[PDB]
Structure 1
């Protein structure tokens, strides 16, 4: 599987503005519009982000393009990070997916704070990293989402993505 498909699973797809997990106006694949409590503020970012009056409504092609641009960010962020690059560079096709997944959801900084996990990942210390990642607030946060991630770092296959 594709990163696009894993993110639809974990993030979901949505052609019209909606509050996320925390209640933030979102759209497409895990797209944050604003923290602010103004649907009106959401639509205006939508539009700017689109370069058209969508009145919250986007079109797949729109969605698609968004995300890709979103994935792009994360990946570079990874590419610029001293803590992540080597870890990333080290992983197999699949575990690298989880990684960007992680950074797609929490940010570069938020993710690099995981010294220990990251190190094990590097050493290929699979059940150990997992043990550690399961102590995080982030695992408490989204346990359903954190569960698949860990599992897969555990496995090295997409098994859990079904």
Structure 2
């Protein structure tokens, strides 16, 4: 198991523009296109991201290319963030994947706002961190995914993804 396989499990794969869990236009493996209600705005963003007139459809290779870029962006966003980088550096490899997963889903700024949870993770108070992480809109809106990610923070294993 690795961060790519982990996010593939959590995000799935769809080759046509679709709406994410928050109603936002998305494609591929969790690639947010826009928060705009305009499907035309989303199609424009898609063509810009792929480099061709897609009309809302991409190939599997194209979806994997955006996914590689998005995972890359999530890691670089963590390392460039003054609140996330100390936590990331303090963690083991499995729990680092859980943090990357959170940033992939909700963005650098959103995760960096989990101040109290981040402190608990930094302190390696795993059960306490897991309890704090669940007191969130994140958990209430995507509980099954949040449970898998939280279990990964609690245990430092991949048990929730096997």
| Cα distance between partner residues in 2 of 1:29 and 1:93 | 22
Secondary structure of 2:43's partner? helix
Residue 69 of structure 2 corresponds to 69
| Cα distance between partner residues in 2 of 1:19 and 1:117 | 29
| Cα distance between partner residues in 1 of 2:58 and 2:69 | 15
Bigger relative contact order, structure 1 or 2 (CA pairs below 8 A, ≥6 apart): 2
Residue 120 of structure 1 corresponds to 120
Deviations 1:38-94 (A, max 9, x none): 322222211111111112111121111101111121111111111111110111111
| Cα distance between partner residues in 2 of 1:94 and 1:29 | 21
RMSD (CA atoms)? 1.2
How many residues align? The count is: 162
Secondary structure of 1:132's partner? helix
| Cα distance between partner residues in 1 of 2:37 and 2:77 | 28
Q: Normalized against structure 2, the TM-score is what?
A: 0.94
| Cα distance between partner residues in 2 of 1:113 and 1:41 | 29
CA drift at 1:134? 1.3
| Cα distance between partner residues in 2 of 1:47 and 1:116 | 40
Q: Normalized against structure 1, the TM-score is what?
A: 0.94
Structure 2: tracts of 5 or more residues without a match:
none
CA drift at 1:132? 0.8
